[PDB]
Amino acid sequence: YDIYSRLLKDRIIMLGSQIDDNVANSIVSQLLFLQAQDSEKDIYLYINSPGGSVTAGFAIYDTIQHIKPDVQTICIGMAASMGSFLLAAGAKGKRFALPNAEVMIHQPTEIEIAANHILKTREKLNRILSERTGQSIEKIQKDTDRDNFLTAEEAKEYGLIDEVMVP
Amino acid sequence: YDIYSRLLKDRIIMLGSQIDDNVANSIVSQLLFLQAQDSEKDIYLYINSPGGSVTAGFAIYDTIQHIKPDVQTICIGMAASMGSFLLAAGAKGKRFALPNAEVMIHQPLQATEIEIAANHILKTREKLNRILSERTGQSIEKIQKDTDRDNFLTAEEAKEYGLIDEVMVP
Amino acid sequence: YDIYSRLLKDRIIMLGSQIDDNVANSIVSQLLFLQAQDSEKDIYLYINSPGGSVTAGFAIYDTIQHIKPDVQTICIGMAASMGSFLLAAGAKGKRFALPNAEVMIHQPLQATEIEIAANHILKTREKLNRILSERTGQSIEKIQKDTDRDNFLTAEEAKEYGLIDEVMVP
Amino acid sequence: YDIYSRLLKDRIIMLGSQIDDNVANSIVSQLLFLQAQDSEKDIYLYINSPGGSVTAGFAIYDTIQHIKPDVQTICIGMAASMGSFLLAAGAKGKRFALPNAEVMIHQPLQATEIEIAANHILKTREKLNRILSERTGQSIEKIQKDTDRDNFLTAEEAKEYGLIDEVMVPE
Amino acid sequence: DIYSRLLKDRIIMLGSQIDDNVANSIVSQLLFLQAQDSEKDIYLYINSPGGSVTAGFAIYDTIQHIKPDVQTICIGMAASMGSFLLAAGAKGKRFALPNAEVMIHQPQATEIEIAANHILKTREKLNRILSERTGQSIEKIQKDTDRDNFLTAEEAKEYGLIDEVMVPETK
Amino acid sequence: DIYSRLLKDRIIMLGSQIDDNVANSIVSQLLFLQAQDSEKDIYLYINSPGGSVTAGFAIYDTIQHIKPDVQTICIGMAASMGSFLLAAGAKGKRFALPNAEVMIHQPTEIEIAANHILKTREKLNRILSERTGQSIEKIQKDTDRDNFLTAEEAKEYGLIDEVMVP
Amino acid sequence: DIYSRLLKDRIIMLGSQIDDNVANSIVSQLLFLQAQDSEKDIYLYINSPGGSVTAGFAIYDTIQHIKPDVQTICIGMAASMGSFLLAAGAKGKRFALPNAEVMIHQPLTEIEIAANHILKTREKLNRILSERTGQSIEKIQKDTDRDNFLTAEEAKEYGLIDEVMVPET
Amino acid sequence: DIYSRLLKDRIIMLGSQIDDNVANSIVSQLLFLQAQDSEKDIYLYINSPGGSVTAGFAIYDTIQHIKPDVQTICIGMAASMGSFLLAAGAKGKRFALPNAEVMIHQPTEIEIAANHILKTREKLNRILSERTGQSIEKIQKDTDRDNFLTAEEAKEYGLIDEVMVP
Amino acid sequence: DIYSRLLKDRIIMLGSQIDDNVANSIVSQLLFLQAQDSEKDIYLYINSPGGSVTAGFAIYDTIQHIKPDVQTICIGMAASMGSFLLAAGAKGKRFALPNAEVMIHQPLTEIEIAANHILKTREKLNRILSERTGQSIEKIQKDTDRDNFLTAEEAKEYGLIDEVMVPET
Amino acid sequence: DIYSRLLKDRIIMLGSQIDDNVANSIVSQLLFLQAQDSEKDIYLYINSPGGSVTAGFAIYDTIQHIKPDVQTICIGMAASMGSFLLAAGAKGKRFALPNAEVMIHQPQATEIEIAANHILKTREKLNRILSERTGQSIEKIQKDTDRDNFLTAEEAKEYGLIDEVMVPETK
Amino acid sequence: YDIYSRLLKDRIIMLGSQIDDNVANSIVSQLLFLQAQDSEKDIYLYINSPGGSVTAGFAIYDTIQHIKPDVQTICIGMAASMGSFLLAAGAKGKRFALPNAEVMIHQPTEIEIAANHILKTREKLNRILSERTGQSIEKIQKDTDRDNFLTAEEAKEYGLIDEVMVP
Amino acid sequence: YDIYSRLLKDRIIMLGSQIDDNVANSIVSQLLFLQAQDSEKDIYLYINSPGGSVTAGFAIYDTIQHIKPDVQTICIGMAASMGSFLLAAGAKGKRFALPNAEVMIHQPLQATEIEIAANHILKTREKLNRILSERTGQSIEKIQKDTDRDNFLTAEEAKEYGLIDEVMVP
């Protein structure tokens, strides 16, 4: 849609789908574009995503950490998976969820999957989540193996977000 | 369609279809865009929707309550569902329906696998009922009963129920 | 076509297909756009339609009556159904048909599941007959009879019936 | 196509396909647009059409007669059906065919269910025959006979029949 | 959109099989270019395996009708109606590039079109026009349009289908 | 739309199999660039597995016909017609990048009939002979077998004038 | 069309499998950027599972041919020709983000495949990788025959990249 | 294959919209059953929303032509042609199940032309008039409007002889 | 074609949404089995989310018309017309397996729908359900307007079935 | 498979548009039934809107060639080649059911077929055969095959297309 | 295939796909058919299934418990979900897995889903699994919420099967 | 195809495609069928397969080892993969390849989401390597190395590796 291009003018990026390579390349491209426009002004990444590929998710994650602008993350609707991993990766103090958002950290192509298990990217995810939430690796390991959905408040108490945006 | 982009210039958003993630993301984007354009002038959300996903519906609902501009809601045609839930969520004093609109709050029982599991673990049905109860002034007991059955309301009955503030008479 | 966007500049809207929710939302959007452009200058709604959903038709009807500009209706080709209902709903003195246009008010007995249930519970068929009665000057008894059978009218007969004010002369 | 919108600037409309409701609505829209642009300057309607729906054809016919500008009709290629009916409906003195154009008035027996019922109840076939009779100068008896059989006419024969005023002969 | 920029230079590309859609597009471009400027001539490049004769005659008639000279240049191939249109360019201004292939064999058309062709005897009309434009007798045109003889650009020039082979300057 | 921006720099990309659609596109771009400027030369990059000889000849003839020099640069691959068009660039201005692969092996209905009646195979072989400096006998032999050439071998053969070294 | 705006900043995204269409697109962008400015360097971001070696060599040759330095940055993954192109960036200017995954395993259209084995392009790949990594041909031959995934750090130690881009700027 | 086993019991199922394919199928089954046995009657079950009148007339004529009595039983629905064929069963042997719904409202290219030139609408109305005992005036009125009949109302109308009560 | 072998044992499987095609198939099987033997009863297994009421009434009427008793057994689910047909089995011979789910909610082609509302078939459904369950029309009207799922035990207590088939035989 | 059981009773159903596939199927069945028994006659039921004349002539020629009499019975409709084949049944054994509709208007064929028809003048051949088999003059057949006149079964019998309307015994 | 019909002659049923309504109706039909053939001889249900609908799974489960013949269950390849639930529902002493089979008890159309949560079929599953494995409801609840894969031996030790079929 | 059903009469099974769940279920079914026919007479499994899912491959493997009849394995064309894993799993002394067959044990890194998660949690790669080690007599170290690289073996080399017992020479 042309709405997303107008939103880009306001430094707003919408991650509103499953995270595959195409989506990752699009999100990465928009982040690089906004840095090139202005390296100081922060970016607003809205997340409504059921999750996706961890390789594609790590591409977005690394780009967020690499660029100069702060990237604010705002969960609307849902963040499962890599969605919630990216939510937790926003600039510190600037990770949000709207009051009725639902968050799940449960971590559920061919060459990508082989790489993940050889390089042990699951361990890498768990360690990053542990650092960014302040939870122990033991707790992250347990919770990323089961299907526990969190409310916005519970996500804040968990350390996945900093604040619930109150109306 | 280039009519909807021209309408966006007048701060008018059309929700004329079933509410899925794509529609919600589109509606949310338009609301965020209009706030960025002008945070003071209110927005006109026209609703002709048979309903849809509750996760997608809550995304729109939360964005409406989050942004600074008042969001007026106007039912044309039909609002069932999440459609009528969003109608009832408009700025107070600014929820309308045209005279021959039809409204149903029946929350049926358009969403995906992971969404559905979340709804029942977090008990979003209870959350819907409680919000409707607050915004209509009806008791939770009555909202629970009415969201379980298929009762269609006229525009007048919807006003009488507390879903809208006014029937827009010619 | 891009022709329709250029026509919108002259405040002309073309209703040239079957009336479903998509078409209704498009026609409603164009009417709201043209009002926002100019609330005083009247609008020209050309109708060549075999009919469609009554819920969708009522959305267009309500929007026509709601907006400030007069909406002129001009039948080219055919108006059956909701098409002829909308033709009769144009601004008074400003409902037309071209000489070889064909009009039928038969309301057959395009719409979706929820819509059809709403129509019968809220008795929109009665509503249609009553509105047609008011706008043609015919009694409800006569409208009821004619909307149950398949009688096609010429442009002249449609004028004599009260569905249009004038057949446009070359 | 990009080309048809540029042609619209020159008040040229191309009817180069079978006449259904979509085509009729498009042609009618272009005619209404050109009148709104300028109600005095005449319009050029080029016709290469194997025919189509009579309801859709009548919509174009009525719009041609209704608007103020003269509508010149020029047959290139073929006009069978409603195509040749519309060719005959152009402004008088301004109906043409190129030398190798082929014209057929055979009204066969592109319309939808409701349209077909309307035609036979309202007797639009009689209406077609009477309009053709008036515009060609032929008797209704002859039009009735010829619209029932498959007789193809050359550009010259179409002129002699009264369907066109002139065949545009090369430079 | 390359074709729209080319239209600015009064260049038209006929690079496909000739059906009603193509004919209507080519006719539209010819009418557009006349409206732009009725004096400056037009360049019609042809790379076409042939097509419908009704659609081909529409293009032919439009070429002869408009005021500007229409130069025809064969690149690649012209078979059929393709070669018929090549031969229909302004006299003295019909060309082919050295490795172009030309075939006049008259072997795409829809139902009503085909019936018209045989009733009005358009095959005879084709043969007579080709005879006039090549300077060959009708007897020779009749024989050659019935068999599959491919011509080189030079042979096409010697046949009278074109006026010159465009020989490239060495570079 | 990258290709439309490249057209502004008089660069054309032939990056696919050569059929009538591609030929008409390439021919149109060549004619457009001539109309823009008939003196400044054109850059035709070639990465093509080959295709129709009739379509290929349409491009070939257009290259020779227009006034500007057309430089030909092989990136990736030129088999078929692809290599025929590579060899047809302005003399002194036919290039291949170092790892380009070139094959001269010459492997619709009406088109195919034309080729064999008019003997376009003989026509190809002779044009290749003239433009490479090889004898017709050698061209005939090599166009019947599947011998791939490196950029250097293509230069030594006479298909290109120079390999563009990094 | 974010990619057309990115082109204004001399940024090219290679985010898919490398076939002839992708190669022609990447080559076209490289030629375009050189024409815009032959002095300022180009940023080629790579997230690619690999692809055709003929198509890959077209990109490789174009990178080496043009005047601007082409920086290569691996985000996500580079397997294949993807990692081959990563290693082909301007020297000192080949990067990977910390969680990127790199594989040099060269796995095992019609006319393209015949060319590769007649001209022995596999040998050519191995020799170029050897030169650009500093590894021996023997080691490159061994490693391109097996499926060993490398972390960003391991890719740097191998010589495929010059630096792991540290989370900052 | 249930329908082939049913054919063994001289049962035919008309359970869809009536087009030429269905008509040719139904006609073929009627002709087959006559050839098997010209004395034993046939059971035609009808659950049809209607269809082409030309196709419907093909079935109608075949029913009247063959020697065996054809019993007609409406299950579910008979609108259109569907109800016309229901009314065309052997006299005393036209049935509907208690909750069946019947409508007589009469709503390819060459077929449609034939119907209006030969006036098959008049032909339908008159056959319905003969077989129901209703006047042509009443049939004309009722075939122009959408009046659904219960099984009992269909019997009282004369479309069927009996409603089969459980 | 397991279903054709099952037909030999007078077993019919209604395991899908009830449309005209399914109804014609079920009706055909019922007529076939009566012709085979008009005395031995028939076993109709139901796992159906519902469907068209016209199609459902065709099956219902055929069940009541034929001579053999038709036993109805709900496996999995019966919503709709599915549960309506379940309740229409021979009396004493309507069953559900222990974990079956039953819903009587009557939810809310072209010509079919018009017929239903003119002839008031909704009223007809409610009255038949009332008669066969022993519940009042008022209660049936209320319950067919809301989405209340019943367990097998609850369906028995409601009067939709006669017995929950206990795990044995 | 109902059709294979019917074949046992020497019954063939022509219930569709007549193309090459249908013609080959009908011809095959006729040859099969002759091989089964060359004396017992065949029953060809016709419900056909028409089709290709080449395909229709294949069926026609096969009917006249085989030894068994071929009875033709029109149910529903016979237009075109359908009515031509109806008229081609064994004399005395051509029937229609009372509500059948017949049209002889000669309006499906592939490219090579259509060229053959007009070179060999198969339209003339059709008209002459119809003339012989109905007893009407060629002049009348020519006129009527050019217009869209539908005939009732009785009118078709009176025209000479069939020998009898099969009137049903009341039951 | 015609192989499955020949296998039916040996009272062997193959459940080798995802369990939806169509599959359930097919499996149920085969079970009813085999009972009608012979009500005394036991049935062999081979399972290679990634899981599926719980309503469809309960239909098969109930039919297994209802019919007279013992139903032996043999896991080949995989049993996740309802697959493993049906594996555990075989006649007691007659639930098997081949040595390299993989078992997971993790319990991950419109009207079906509503019914499940109103009637609390998840509780019903957990209680049945508890009864048939001998594990406590607390343990079943925990394990059906997380993605723990079991070997054939581990499945036997868990109580999902009685024996690993040794070569 | 009716050739494969006639071949089943001679106790011959053809595995001539990629190994997915459908193929595995088909092969397993045929093995169970042939055992039921006759538990003593051995079975001939011809293999021309580029490999596939390891879960599906293990299903076939387990069934081969479970049933009573000896299963002879004969490689025609190619066995990569799971294909070659199954070739090596034939009855001992009865594993063959035709002279121009090609064998690769490279276990690449055709299966579905849940399958792949199981393989890595239960470490089925280790299980494959250990079984190959036992059935070829090669050390686990060598099997680990060779299953990680793409080394194609001739029929002779496959015999020399211990994957087959004999090359079937004409």
XYZ file of C-alpha atoms in Angstrom, chain E residues 4 17 25 35 38 47 62 66-68 73 77-78 87 91 94 106 128 135 139 141 148 151 170:
24
model
C 5.177 5.755 -25.705
C 0.606 -11.348 -34.627
C -3.868 -0.312 -31.011
C -3.846 14.580 -34.781
C -0.828 15.803 -40.250
C 8.186 -7.769 -37.314
C -6.201 3.626 -41.789
C -4.565 9.498 -42.922
C -2.664 12.445 -44.423
C 0.912 11.656 -43.286
C 10.387 -0.927 -42.413
C 10.005 -11.103 -40.493
C 6.838 -10.236 -42.423
C 3.691 -3.433 -49.237
C 5.416 4.437 -52.287
C 8.896 0.790 -48.065
C -1.998 -15.916 -47.392
C -5.805 -7.211 -56.398
C 3.233 -4.220 -60.193
C -2.187 -14.349 -61.918
C -0.033 -12.885 -57.026
C 4.994 -20.980 -49.028
C 11.807 -14.094 -49.958
C 30.151 -0.103 -41.892
